[PDB]
Amino acid sequence: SKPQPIAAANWKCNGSQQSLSELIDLFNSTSINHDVQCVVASTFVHLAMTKERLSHPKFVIAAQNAIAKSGAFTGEVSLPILKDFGVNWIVLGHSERRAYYGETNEIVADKVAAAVASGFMVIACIGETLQERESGRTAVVVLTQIAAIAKKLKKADWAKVVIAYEPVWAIGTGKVATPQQAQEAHALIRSWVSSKIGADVAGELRILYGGSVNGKNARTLYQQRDVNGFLVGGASLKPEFVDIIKATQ
């Protein structure tokens, strides 16, 4: 017995009106018969189009980032802005952002807290590098990530949180990650939550696999005990995302 799965599509910084419109269309067609939460996370610029055009009852929209308050932050987009706009979902603290845009754990932690406080469903990202992994530092890092986030949350706040574990060590590196390696990590996050936050929170918590997933492997990855869905990059700009959703039962 698992919680409700989530098939999240992180379109990242990609797409055109034309190409996206098409994909939206493929999606609304999809017959999904089980309890799953489909999430399409578009660029800020594509939100409106996606909003109007996505009609499927299992699909909800997410933004790929946000700052906490409004004000003088040229080029940024805030939680109030998003909330007014009718977005209740958010990806926070992705790998690409921690790398290229200076997202310390504490910045992420703060963002998650702000979001949770504004009523969003947060897909908060954690995950270690090839360097970190290699040097025997996996658990230390992942637990620190989750702990930093954990601090600012009250127990009741966990209902608003989804964790996506990203194997950074396996992305762009050459390395392969097996379903047992996903699961090793997944189970260690849940361990942590169970232990510090509580078994009841633990049981309900969605831990999405945030690494390389496609139509071929998603069923297998899904087979694992602590894999509750996916945060999809590549395969999300594609028709196979539909197999990704199916693979969640």
Residue 83 burial (CB count, 10 A)? 16
- Report whether 151 belongs to an annotated binding site: no
Based on its alpha-carbon atoms, the radius of gyration of the chain, rounded to whole angstroms, reads 17
Could you give the CA distance from residue 84 to residue 213 in angstroms, rounded to a whole number?
A: 33
**Interaction between residue 229 and ligand 3PP (CB under 6 A):** no
Residues shown for the chain: 249
**Interaction between residue 245 and ligand 3PP (CB under 6 A):** no
127 binds, among a copy of itself, ligand 3PP, none (CB under 5 to 8 A by kind): none
**Interaction between residue 10 and ligand 3PP (CB under 6 A):** yes
Q: Which of 60, 38, 36, 58 is nearest to 50 (CA)?
A: 60
Number of residues that bind a copy of itself (CB under 8 A): 43
Q: Is 103 a catalytic residue?
A: no
Query: Residue 221: CB partners within 8 Å, gap ≥ 6?
Result: 179, 182, 209, 213, 227, 230, 247
85 binds, among ligand 3PP, a copy of itself, none (CB under 5 to 8 A by kind): a copy of itself
**Interaction between residue 211 and ligand 3PP (CB under 6 A):** yes
Q: Is 94 a catalytic residue?
A: yes
**Interaction between residue 82 and a copy of itself (CB under 8 A):** yes
C-alpha distances in Å from residue 60, one per residue of 70, 136, 181, 220, 245: 24, 38, 30, 25, 14
Could you give the CA distance from residue 36 to residue 79 in angstroms, rounded to a whole number?
A: 25
| CB of 93 or CB of 233, closer to ligand 3PP | 233
| CB of 65 or CB of 183, closer to a copy of itself | 65
Determine the Cα angle at 64 with ends 2 and 116, to 5°: 60
The one-character DSSP state at 11 is -
- Report whether 10 belongs to an annotated binding site: yes
Question: x/- binding map, residues 165-194, to ligand 3PP, per CB under 6 A?
Answer: -x----xx----------------------
Q: Retrieve residue 182's tokens.
A: 């996903």
CB of 165 to a copy of itself, least distance (A): 15
Q: Which residues bind ligand 3PP (CB under 6 A)?
A: 10, 166, 171-172, 210-213, 231-234
Catalytic residues: 94, 166
Please enumerate, by residue number, every residue annotated as part of a binding site for substrate.
Answer: 10, 12
Q: Which residues bind a copy of itself (CB under 8 A)?
A: 10, 12-17, 41, 43-49, 64-65, 67, 70-78, 80-82, 84-85, 91, 94-97, 100-102, 171-172, 233
